Symmetry: C5
Amino acid sequence: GIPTELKPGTNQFLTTDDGVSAPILPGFHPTPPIHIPGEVHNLLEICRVETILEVNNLKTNETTPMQRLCFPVSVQSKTGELCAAFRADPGRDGPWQSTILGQLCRYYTQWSGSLEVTFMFAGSFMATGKMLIAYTPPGGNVPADRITAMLGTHVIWDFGLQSSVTLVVPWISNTHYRADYYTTGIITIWYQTNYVVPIGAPTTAYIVALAAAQDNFTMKLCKDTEDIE
Amino acid sequence: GIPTELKPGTNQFLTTDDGVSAPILPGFHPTPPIHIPGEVHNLLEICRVETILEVNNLKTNETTPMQRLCFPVSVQSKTGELCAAFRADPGRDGPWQSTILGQLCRYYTQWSGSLEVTFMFAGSFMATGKMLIAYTPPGGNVPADRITAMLGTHVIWDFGLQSSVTLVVPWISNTHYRADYYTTGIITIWYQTNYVVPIGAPTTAYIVALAAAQDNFTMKLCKDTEDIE
Amino acid sequence: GIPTELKPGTNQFLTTDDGVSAPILPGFHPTPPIHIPGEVHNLLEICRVETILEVNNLKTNETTPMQRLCFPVSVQSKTGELCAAFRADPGRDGPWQSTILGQLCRYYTQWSGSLEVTFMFAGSFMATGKMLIAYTPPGGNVPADRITAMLGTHVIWDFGLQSSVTLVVPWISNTHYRADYYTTGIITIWYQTNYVVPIGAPTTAYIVALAAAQDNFTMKLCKDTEDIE
Amino acid sequence: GIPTELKPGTNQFLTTDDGVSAPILPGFHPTPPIHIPGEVHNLLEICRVETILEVNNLKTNETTPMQRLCFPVSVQSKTGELCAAFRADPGRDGPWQSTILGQLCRYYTQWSGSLEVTFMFAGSFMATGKMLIAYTPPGGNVPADRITAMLGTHVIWDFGLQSSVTLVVPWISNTHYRADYYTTGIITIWYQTNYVVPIGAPTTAYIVALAAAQDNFTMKLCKDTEDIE
Amino acid sequence: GIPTELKPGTNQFLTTDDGVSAPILPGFHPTPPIHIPGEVHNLLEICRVETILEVNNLKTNETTPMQRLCFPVSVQSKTGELCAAFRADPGRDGPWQSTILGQLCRYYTQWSGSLEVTFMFAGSFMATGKMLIAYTPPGGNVPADRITAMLGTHVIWDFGLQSSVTLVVPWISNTHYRADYYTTGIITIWYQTNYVVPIGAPTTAYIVALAAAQDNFTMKLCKDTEDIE
């Protein structure tokens, strides 16, 4: 016979070894496949899909969760006051947990790329006004007033002209540190002008926030989530 | 020597593994083969052969089984009355158990294709009349009267003209469900006209039913039968 | 290393396995061969050689075995009487055991082919007469008289003309059955004429029988003999 | 299966065997590399770098080690007297231990090649004088006076002209013997002239010694050092 | 993995198996070789070298062994008398044990070829005379007198003309038999003429015997000797 020498690692079962096992049923011809639309090949295909951000994730909402899907604007708000704010942390807890992206991020250890957040205005066709959207880069001081936010990366959104507007988070990474000191970029929504509306129209309307990863987004190192029990 | 690593599955005996064993008698030259007509290569060759259906499988027959091989028609029967009925269930119990097809179906788990049932009339050459053969598609209501059966897939058979006629079950599948709700297609034989005969001829004749699978018939997943003990 | 899986049959020693073992003395160069006439390659070469049949295997011979090598003819014998008889059963007990062929047949399980038996006459050059040799095919009734033997396959041998004559058993097979019913072909030697001799010559002479397998003879399935102890 | 025979050495783990093991994480794509200047490929690249010799390794220095990095010359010294002396023994204890070369030599068993020692003069730009550097070949008597040293391989160094001078140890080997009798080449620094200086300049200056292996230097047979604990 | 089957001989260590083992030090580059004159490739190179035969191996010599290296001739010896005698048995005990050939023969089991024995005369340049050398073939009667030896293979050696002469043993083999009956060829040295010498020259001189195997000499089957303890 052929002189062989068993080397270390013989007889071991590695749950990640990718070998070939004996077919239990050699004579069986599995039912052949047909065409089913919507086949997915890579999870990133799913991450590029906009899902709803629960920006309005208040403790008082928990019992009427349907209200977390959108936040509001109103006439009472004065020009220049802060409307809402949240950071762009897909993996971490918070608004992003509701998105398909943030849920899949938990299934991985590292990730990086651009993100795009879309804002949709639902109020009466008769309403008009301007909101100021601002992205404060990582390791930056959250804007104090409307005027400072304006000096940074921002977008004046006139919902009297566009019912929707999209912002792009240029770049994110994620590093675990703990037992803080970390801080990723911060989106802040400001009232540039107050909410203007004629007689006969609701004086309180809602904004819906959707988000998704762009093409350059990628992830590595799998790890089962902690989202279930 | 050659560095090898034994992988999981070493030393196991799989009754379905298809390996090569050492020839017990290496010097032996087995007697060479000759030509024997009728070599069979695939069981389906056998399934395409018409065998006799025991349509007349009555509890009162059991002691004189030879009578199950054929059912009868007579003068007493009135025009339009139901003569016989059975479904096209090769694998299941019933008339099909007598056929070579139904016996081989038990040796498998799944099957599908077309079937063809042939009816032969044995009565006196002097007899004439018309029988109506009808196939009621799967999940269909068995014909109530001759007239409704006529509206479905049917064949007016005049045994005064043709001593034999063949019907084709377009398509069958089989799904186990149980402990009903399943129902495959139903062949129904009706008296279109009464049995006509002159003086001197038997007033009771018999029909013989033969059946076989067509070419598109196929089976998969072997399993030892329950027909023996 | 190379992923391998030990299959059933590992570690077994099959006395008929034909493998390769490690040379006990790798540096040794065995004495080279020279030419020795008479090299044998196949046992059948030996079977084609005529050896002496002990046709005269009487219980009264055992103490003077040299007499089994030949039987006799004499003047006392009357025209038409049976001289000797034996069957063509190489493997079985009897006259054939003395031949090299019958001895080698015991070393095998099956065999078939033609055989040739030669008869040699040793008496005085002055003697003359005719003997009738007859082969009675397998499953045939042994000749009752000279006349019937003559109607079957036979040879009129005039030892006044030929000192030797050869007969050919067309075909033999062998089937074990037992604990008869089997019977292979039967050679019968008859006196066609009486033994004629002048004054001065011995009135009793001997015939020697030699036999061998022809070219079409072959054997299969080895098995140690029962000839030794 | 394939007939194999396990040979001696099966199941052994040799700490120096260079095999291939199963990748613990087959789906992982390690972060790709980028360019980092200063990649090292062979330790000899480091050995060709001049490092400081602690020629002034006195027992009285130990508490002010910074003084071992350089030895001195002064006016008090008379023409012809010995300034310093040490041998060219990279691996062994002594001045060479401070060099990167001598430290790496301990990580090996054998070595051989040329070495180059550089001497740098740090005193006032106004000082002048001549030092005599001499290499006494292996198995040679260390020079007794300046005059004999001059007859051997030497270099008259005028630090009034050159602030630095380099000497080349032609060849070294190393052989362990012990429990001496071994002796490698000996560098001796002599005062050819006394230290000359004008009014206003320090009357004591220092020499710094740097050394490195040349290109032909090579080492073999690794062995963990004894420099740590 | 690859289906393999361990065959008999697995896990065995055969001291003569010629396999490949793992290099204990894979990174080590052994010191390279240089040219050393006198490399030997085959032991037969050594066997072709003449070494001194201890023909004069007397029991009385043992305490002054230097005398075994040569035997003598003298004036007292009468014309025709036997001078010395020994056989050509390299492997066996006796004179041949002193030769390099006989010592190496013990390291083997079989051998065969030609041998050549050289005789050298050391006496005074003034001496003359003739010696008769005779080889008595294996299985031959040792010569009784000078005259019979002369009739066989012989050489008349006149040491007044040639100071040396060489004899060739045409062929030897060796067969162990024992617990004689064996006998290989016998060299016999005779005095053809007496030793002649003038006044002033020694009346006793010595002959030195050297022997070696020729080119056709070869050996097979190694076996450790019995020459040491």
